[PDB]
Design a protein around this ligand. Structure first.
Ligand SMILES: COC(=O)[C@H]1[C@H]2C[C@@H]3c4[nH]c5cc(OC)ccc5c4CCN3C[C@H]2C[C@@H](OC(=O)c2cc(OC)c(OC)c(OC)c2)[C@@H]1OC
Ligand SMILES: C[C@H](N)Cc1ccccc1
Lengths: 383, 384
């Protein structure tokens, strides 16, 4: 038993969860196309079902999140964290062996439940082990940065491994990685609830801005590979690689603007990020080849990095100024924004792409971001 | 012969707008020996706005030479009337005459530049350099009048402008040859049909909104500076210098980049930047804090102007017949509406609701209107 082991376990758990999220982007549409049969343009019939499939994780996470915390209070943190590995292993095995649309729905729902349990239990365990109030910041920083490395090699790893080795390869590799995390875990050893924190407009504005800045990438996942196969005729292994700018630019932007945003005001960073997101989403559906997406996607990643680096300290300051704040207060509010975005984006986006064209959806999202952008002026100098 | 026409329009806009800004140092102090003075300055925008619809249709039947020569004559008469008049009612009329001359010169010159230059990119370059000349006139005019009123007298700068206008008229007579009435063979679209085109309306609205955003901020800033910052008198003019300098740089630099980057993207980014700059202007607590937002405002306005001037001729070439008088009359009306509305009602609006809410409203309007420039990406052509 040691303090570093819990850090390594939480690191591997969050990495596996985000990797399993991001590796299902270029495999589900390709798998659904290959079973039926560049190719044909029948994917518009199934775009609604593919959109509804991606929202299952967000909906299940939003449902099961309120019940986790009292459960961790009652029976501790180690037992609920172990359930996350079991559910993630079951989901990753069912993904590899699934052949029909029904099983992938169950896989996504199970992944949502396991992700919620693993995240809450791991953060609680890290808070419990470290009790110095200054090393806790470094530990939380490393654990949350584990999401970035997990995000970076997740999306262009299923696409590359799909066309060369097989469809059961990446899921089996993730399963073997998840099994190693459980082996390490075996050798181990209050104020202002969330519904009151969403009753003041200063926090609702920030949460909505985070959600609307992340919806641009939330609704770009299920609809971009189908668009690529329909119009640009790219090979099946470049669909994942078309998302690499959205990760690398996001990491660069979050580093630079976490360093630099305090000098020029956080609200200005948020406003410029939302405007850049809107312009990039507008410029996305004009490309006629794969190389035309290296610019708009990079801008989208940079702008989302701007918003996500300038908004979290604002929420922390707002919670400290007017309420009683704990270690996980900012995390809970941010999680609802991401989950709400991933649950509302794809489900409506599929219906919009069926009813009207794909470019109109991007235009709508860009207009929404631009219109919401002026409202960040409220966040300066809160009382 | 196509290069020298740019020189004629360059000098014509340089001299006409120079008289626009030279008056401001010299008239408010001279009458003393606020609303009365402000309504004087807005007479040019109002009268030039009305004469514009009667200039566009006239250009088909007369040509682009007679209106420009008439504008030169009216400008010379206005500057001579300024140089000798010594009362309020004799200074109102000269401003009205200068407005008429400015309307003639702007519409005729931009139409002639559009007709001489046919390629879209090469026309964008010329319109960029002409707007650069206008910006240089605006920048140079005020200190010129202030220095030669402090040191030499009142009647000196107007007489010097009269001599320069005579030289411009000599150059015009040598180059343009304004001696006969030449009717254009093409019968252009009527001015009421062009207003039913959504794209022309979008372009005119973008120009009007950006210019209104600057035109409200121009007269209503010194009062706020006095009431909050407590700054001396000599910093008032220096506050707005970055806007003029950045506008000159932007209008000389973005005419080249608008074609490469895309007109709609340049206009969108300009409107967003002008909205953010106006939104951040009311937050400064000293003179040094207004350097950034004013420069951003000038750059954004240069972006919008250089992007949306050639777009009018492009739309008229794509959809309607190739006669460029009426569309640039519409563009000049969009230019002049902001200055017509700003000085007259800015004090009333500020006393009614407050300066920061005015800035917030203008910025939010620009930001919301910014998405509508996407519609100018590729307008459909007319049926063959
Ligand atoms: C699924 O992706 C995620 O799940 C993460 C990202 C969401 C989003 C995203 N998805 C993509 C999927 C792609 O596939 C093709 C490609 C590109 C992207 C991008 C680019 C843009 N990107 C941003 C990522 C943000 C991550 O969240 C945090 O970094 C974070 C940090 C904190 O510390 C301050 C928190 O505490 C307050 C916190 O609270 C909940 C969250 C978030 O969750 C961990
Ligand atoms: C030429 C612009 N419509 C007016 C302006 C622009 C920039 C600065 C000051 C004034």
């Amino acid at each position: 038993a040691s303090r570093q082991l819990v850090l390594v376990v939480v690191f591997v758990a969050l990495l596996l969860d985000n990797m399993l999220f991001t590796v299902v982007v270029p495999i589900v549409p390709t798998f659904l196309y290959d079973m039926e049969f560049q190719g044909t343009g029948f994917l518009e019939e199934e775009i609604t079902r593919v959109g509804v499939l991606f929202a299952s994780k967000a909906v299940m996470q939003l449902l099961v999140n309120p019940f986790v915390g009292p459960l961790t209070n009652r029976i501790g943190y180690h037992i609920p964290m172990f359930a996350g590995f079991v559910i993630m292993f079951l989901s990753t095995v069912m993904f590899a062996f699934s052949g029909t649309y029904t099983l992938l729905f169950v896989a996504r729902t199970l992944q949502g439940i396991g992700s919620s349990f693993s995240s809450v239990a791991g953060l609680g365990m890290l808070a419990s082990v470290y009790t110095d109030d200054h090393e806790r910041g470094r530990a939380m920083g490393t654990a949350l940065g584990g999401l970035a490395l997990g995000l970076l090699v997740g999306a262009p790893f299923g696409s590359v491994m799909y066309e060369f080795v097989g469809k059961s390869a990446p899921f089996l590799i993730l399963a073997f990685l998840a099994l190693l995390d459980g082996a390490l875990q075996l050798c181990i050893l209050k104020g202002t609830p969330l519904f009151m924190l969403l009753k003041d407009p200063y926090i609702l504005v920030a949460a909505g801005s985070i959600c609307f800045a992340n919806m641009g990438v939330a609704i770009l996942e299920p609809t971009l590979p189908i668009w690529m196969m329909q119009t640009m005729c790219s090979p099946k292994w470049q669909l994942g690689l078309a998302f690499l700018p959205a990760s690398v630019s996001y990491l660069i932007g979050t580093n630079l603007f976490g360093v630099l945003a305090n000098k020029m005001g956080r609200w200005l960073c948020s406003l410029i990020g939302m405007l850049v997101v809107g312009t990039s989403l507008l410029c996305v559906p004009l490309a006629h080849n794969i190389f035309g997406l290296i610019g708009p996607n990079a801008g989208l990643g940079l702008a989302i990095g701007m918003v996500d680096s300038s908004m979290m300290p604002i929420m922390g300051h707002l919670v400290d100024l007017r309420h009683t704040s704990v270690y996980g207060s900012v995390y809970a509010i941010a999680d609802v924004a991401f989950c709400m975005g991933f649950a509302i984006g794809p489900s409506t986006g599929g219906a919009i792409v069926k009813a009207i064209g794909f470019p109109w959806l991007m235009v709508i999202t860009g207009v929404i971001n631009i219109v919401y952008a002026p409202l960040c002026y409220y966040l300066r100098s809160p009382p």
